[PDB]
């Protein structure tokens, strides 16, 4: 309207906002639709959900390389979303109990998954570094408003996504059973509005043409810079001064440069995996610690599980608070918060919401008589200072590491370090799946431990992140 | 393994609770069902409950109100129908799958691999 903010990005988040309801909308009846449609054992329907939300984590490599190395961006988004719509039609054809049975169901569901995370892998990137391309280098601070407005709008849909769809498939009857159809439809032309409403824009859009192919120049680059130093006889300049230095016969400076910024950055992101494991360990222990505590609270009476939803709500409230406040108080001193400041303090915020989770929980167990009530009981309050930290935390992580992420990688590649981003996420779950099996210990211990790792590893990331050299 | 049941005779409008105890291989690996085979016909789908008894399904029958619930500590299963009439007076089968990774319906009688003997629920 004004200045510094293109009219382009309207349809940017609002694309996405309908993207990211449609998909929570989808995978919320996803199990139920294993269980009591295709009649799916408990073990393979958990399997097949497991796989899929892999899948969605980790295509993202694939829609990047897609996108950076070729066929440039806007037109792999384009290209995509048409990929999530058929997707999406082949999942609603499949719920139909109308045409085949227990094999057309499967064969359609299967494939409309595998083209729903496909699509997914691919507008996930590609969608925050056009956003991102359409802001002046010059005008940095707008780009960190646009990324807070991008992640309000993703928060704001899962919220909405919580509050609308058990309206979905609460009794309703498709073909004289429960209407699973609409289920699937409903998100299916959500995501079709989306991709409708991105394209509208086309015209006003900046669409920056690709730099060629830089996934395969890149990985050359690499395996010349190793292979050179293999002097194994011999050997007087392997590589002097870095270990890509002398890959430079060939790829000119150019490239060893974007190379070199993609390294460090990829180095630097090495131990987010386990900070996204521990955190993403916190939806599922504290509706433990939630049920063996009270929630009449006087007014209205709250369940454990629908406490989760206060960590979504919560996020819409500090990503206005923080950035146009908080940063703002910052910023009347000589305090400089560089972006990486920003990520260590959110991980010692996380470190510290376990901490008060761990203390909540020997609370609870500290409970004594005077149906038998306990004096001691604490109420589903106490619960409000770990969310409050926790949500903090995560705001501070992940919208300063979309603005970094985008910031600090080489225009040639912008898009693949949002891919390296949402690769460490995919392999932070990949750990928390592993590790869920083996729970043997006590809750408060368990909570301990969390922390004294999360501390752990913000020291490693504080460590490395003090000898990170910026991309300039 | 070595499934068994349990149950008799019930009023035209009472309640029975049937049982169903294994007596080998451990009862977390193991997810069950309810079938019946009424006289002169085939065998229908009663219920069905999942290992830790965290998924729990019931035919579109469910004649009155049936519920399905399991204890794995002394490996012990009970259905608990409510509301019977005059129909589902049949022989009621007590069936057993050890947990695997398969796409065959839970709803079905090739799903499960072992099934015990009946009872004889009349009305
Ligand atoms: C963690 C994300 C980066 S946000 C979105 C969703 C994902 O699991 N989670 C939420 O919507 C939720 N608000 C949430 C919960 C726990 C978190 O640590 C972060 C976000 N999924 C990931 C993705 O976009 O790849």
Redesign the interface.
Known sequence: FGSSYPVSIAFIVVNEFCERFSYYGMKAVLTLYFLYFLHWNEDTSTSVYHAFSSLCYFTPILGAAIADSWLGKFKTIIYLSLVYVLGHVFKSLGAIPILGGKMLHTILSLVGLSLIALGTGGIKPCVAAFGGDQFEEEHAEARTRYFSVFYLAINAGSLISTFITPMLRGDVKCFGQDCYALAFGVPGLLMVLALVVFAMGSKMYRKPPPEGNIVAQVIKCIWFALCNRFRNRSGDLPKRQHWLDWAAEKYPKHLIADVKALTRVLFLYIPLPMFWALLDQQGSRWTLQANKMNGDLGFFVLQPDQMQVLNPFLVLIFIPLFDLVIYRLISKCRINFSSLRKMAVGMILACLAFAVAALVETKINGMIHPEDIPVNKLSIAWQLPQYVLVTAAEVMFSVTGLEFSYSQAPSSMKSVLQAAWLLTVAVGNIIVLVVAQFSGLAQWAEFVLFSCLLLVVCLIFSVMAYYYVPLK | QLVESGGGLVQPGGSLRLLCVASGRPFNDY?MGWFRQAPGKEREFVASI???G??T?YSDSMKGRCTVSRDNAKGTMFLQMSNLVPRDTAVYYCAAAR?????K????EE?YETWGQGTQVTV
């Open positions: 997810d999942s290992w830790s965290r998924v399904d947990r695997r990774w398969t796409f319906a839970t709803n079905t799903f």
